[PDB]
Design a protein around this ligand. Sequence first.
Ligand SMILES: N[C@@H](CCC(=O)N[C@@H](CS[C@H]1C([N+](=O)[O-])=C[C@@H]([N+](=O)[O-])C=C1[N+](=O)[O-])C(=O)NCC(=O)O)C(=O)O
Ligand SMILES: N[C@@H](CCC(=O)N[C@@H](CS[C@H]1C([N+](=O)[O-])=C[C@@H]([N+](=O)[O-])C=C1[N+](=O)[O-])C(=O)NCC(=O)O)C(=O)O
Lengths: 218, 218
Amino acid sequence: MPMILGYWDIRGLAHAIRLLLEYTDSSYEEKKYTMGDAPDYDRSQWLNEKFKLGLDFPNLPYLIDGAHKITQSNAILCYIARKHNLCGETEEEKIRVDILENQTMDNHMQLGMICYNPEFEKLKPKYLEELPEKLKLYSEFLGKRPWFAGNKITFVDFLVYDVLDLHRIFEPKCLDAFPNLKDFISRFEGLEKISAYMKSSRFLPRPVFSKMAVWGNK
Amino acid sequence: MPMILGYWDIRGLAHAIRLLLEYTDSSYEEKKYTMGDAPDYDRSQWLNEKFKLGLDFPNLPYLIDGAHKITQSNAILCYIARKHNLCGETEEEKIRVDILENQTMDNHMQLGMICYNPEFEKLKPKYLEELPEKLKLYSEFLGKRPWFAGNKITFVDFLVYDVLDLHRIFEPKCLDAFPNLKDFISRFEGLEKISAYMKSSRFLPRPVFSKMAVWGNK
Ligand SMILES: N[C@@H](CCC(=O)N[C@@H](CS[C@H]1C([N+](=O)[O-])=C[C@@H]([N+](=O)[O-])C=C1[N+](=O)[O-])C(=O)NCC(=O)O)C(=O)O
Ligand SMILES: N[C@@H](CCC(=O)N[C@@H](CS[C@H]1C([N+](=O)[O-])=C[C@@H]([N+](=O)[O-])C=C1[N+](=O)[O-])C(=O)NCC(=O)O)C(=O)O
């Protein structure tokens, strides 16, 4: 049995999971759900199935792995990471992992909040004002380490990468002030299975968000 | 030396952390920060200090424990839980923990979203329409277990409790359709250190949210 990863036919919250899945070399298939166009943005393809998957808190994404039925993107992430020693070894490694796990989710919500907000264009200047600061925190937090946890790559590297990439897309010249972060993107995309996957026809970098979006809905 | 827990002089995101601190018998003080009144809810008392605490991602709440400086409520929670074997033993225990860790965070966000929304009064009927459903998921998820992880109490029990309590305070009869959840509230408040603490002058059940709020700002 391969694992099933369920999600909308977009990037969204599955990106880190897909990347992690590939990096770990895990047998799996995606169950992609399509969303209708305006003004309903019909979701019945997912809603017809939402409550019949034995999920405890029906949501997307979800991962199904035989008996284990998982929701909550970070939960899927640590569940997979655990099978391959990537949830962090030492105590220091774990702290950093717990922080970044939630820190990235926050910066992600924040991006997604405006990109789904009809006011998108007016909010953008302020969000761009503050971006440099957000990225500085990551840069300083990474410091001279090869990975965010420390010396070993871990699943939060996938979360941090996704967030950084997203912004390089949103604001091309948004990483230049931080060599080490650009080095991080190199290392990560330089990883063999990551590279191979990025070249494959499975890669799915866009849409970034669902159709409801004002930006990256395309 | 005692640990410092920093947060607004409210309940908010610290409630689970306070409860957990007491239950584990942890040695700690609070650094409480006050917020100004309308219409600029000044936050300089925290802002004057925000960047000088050696925090990696300055935020509230934070926990300071000698060399370890932590942010992100869930990270503080697991960090403490680990010192006392409460982040989950088995694999099944961990999955459940990871899920609820994020699941509660979501239902909390959701509540906090409308209670901070000026439109509070119009949004309320719709939120109460779904008020139950959400609770049903918890009830079914708990099932016949004494705790949400399984047979051992763990730190998510604190998160789930807070969320259930918050709603009972918002929708009294919002827990009648689910005996087992009321039993959970019994067990939890029935815990000795919990009970003692709830009677102490340290107990801080309100305000629920910051002053900016339309509900539970009082
Ligand atoms: N915290 C959960 C996220 C759960 C969630 O909201 N999932 C959304 C898509 S995320 C989506 C999003 N995005 O596309 O990146 C981000 C957006 N946002 O504000 O950041 C919220 C989303 N949304 O529209 O629901 C969903 O479709 N749930 C199925 C259901 O409820 O039936 C997790 O990490 O798994
Ligand atoms: N993900 C972090 C969230 C940290 C956070 O958002 N803290 C807010 C207060 S939470 C607050 C809230 N509440 O009080 O319960 C809930 C609300 N919400 O929508 O859920 C968001 C809040 N807010 O006002 O930002 C803050 O004051 N940050 C300090 C800073 O950034 O300088 C965590 O879990 O610790």
